[PDB]
Write a protein that holds these residues in place. Structure first.
Motif, short mmCIF file in Angstrom:
data_model
loop_
_atom_site.label_atom_id
_atom_site.label_comp_id
_atom_site.label_asym_id
_atom_site.label_seq_id
_atom_site.Cartn_x
_atom_site.Cartn_y
_atom_site.Cartn_z
N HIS A 36 0.80 -1.20 0.00
CA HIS A 36 0.00 0.00 0.00
C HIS A 36 0.84 1.25 0.00
O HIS A 36 1.09 1.89 1.04
N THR A 39 0.70 4.53 2.04
CA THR A 39 1.03 4.60 3.47
C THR A 39 2.43 5.17 3.67
O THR A 39 2.71 5.88 4.64
N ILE A 99 -3.92 9.87 9.46
CA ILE A 99 -3.96 8.48 9.04
C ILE A 99 -5.36 7.93 8.93
O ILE A 99 -6.02 7.73 9.97
N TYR A 103 -6.08 2.87 6.55
CA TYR A 103 -4.64 2.54 6.64
C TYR A 103 -4.36 1.69 7.86
O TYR A 103 -3.42 0.88 7.86
#
Ligand code: HEM
Length: 151
Positions: A36, A39, A99, A103
């Motif tokens: 991902h 991130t 965030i 995530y």
């Protein structure tokens, strides 16, 4: 709400993690950033890293993996009674680090994957399901704090 049996399965495998907190933290962060890449972009400290070898070579990354897993371990050992531990984490992650909960789902997948690779004999399907439940509880409770804050 996890049963006592489920918490035992979670903490049994977690005690295996704590024999090499740093190695697990590296495996988990790297899986997260590879799987991902958005991130990675959230970390000014790490967004210079462009390859898996570079990530594996970064001592600063290894240090942050220990910070992450040390915090998570302290939460898990509270078996749900983790309000005090989540408050600061949800506040920093919502308001400072920005965030998304999604995530947090991504890092939960990474944790589960690395635990299976490192501890298969203590991470069969029953323990995988229990750890999933524990990380879902974590996310549910952080999400409620995010909603309060408008994030
Ligand atoms: C198991 C889930 C997680 C735990 C337990 C955790 C824990 C922590 C802790 C203990 C800190 C330092 C204290 C603080 O600022 O609150 C921190 C910092 C931070 N975390 Fe997390 N974290 C998690 C997931 C994530 C995810 C998924 C992201 C990004 C996608 C992230 C991004 C950040 C950032 C950007 C910082 C600041 C790093 C710095 O520049 O020093 N965290 N985290």
């Amino acid at each position: 709400v996890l049963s006592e049996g489920e918490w035992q399965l979670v903490l049994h495998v977690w005690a295996k993690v704590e024999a090499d907190v740093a190695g697990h933290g590296q495996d988990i962060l790297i899986r997260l950033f590879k799987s991902h890449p958005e991130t990675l972009e959230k970390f000014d400290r790490f967004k210079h890293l462009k390859t898996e070898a570079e990530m594996k070579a970064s001592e600063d990354l290894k240090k942050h993996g220990v910070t992450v897993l040390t915090a998570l371990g302290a939460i898990l050992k509270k078996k749900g009674h983790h309000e005090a531990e989540l408050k600061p984490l949800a506040q920093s992650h919502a308001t400072k680090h920005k965030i998304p909960i999604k995530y947090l789902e991504f890092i939960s997948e990474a944790i589960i994957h690395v635990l299976h690779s490192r501890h298969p004999g203590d991470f069969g399907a029953d323990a995988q399901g229990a750890m999933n439940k524990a990380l879902e509880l974590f996310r549910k409770d952080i999400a409620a704090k995010y909603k309060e804050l408008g994030y």
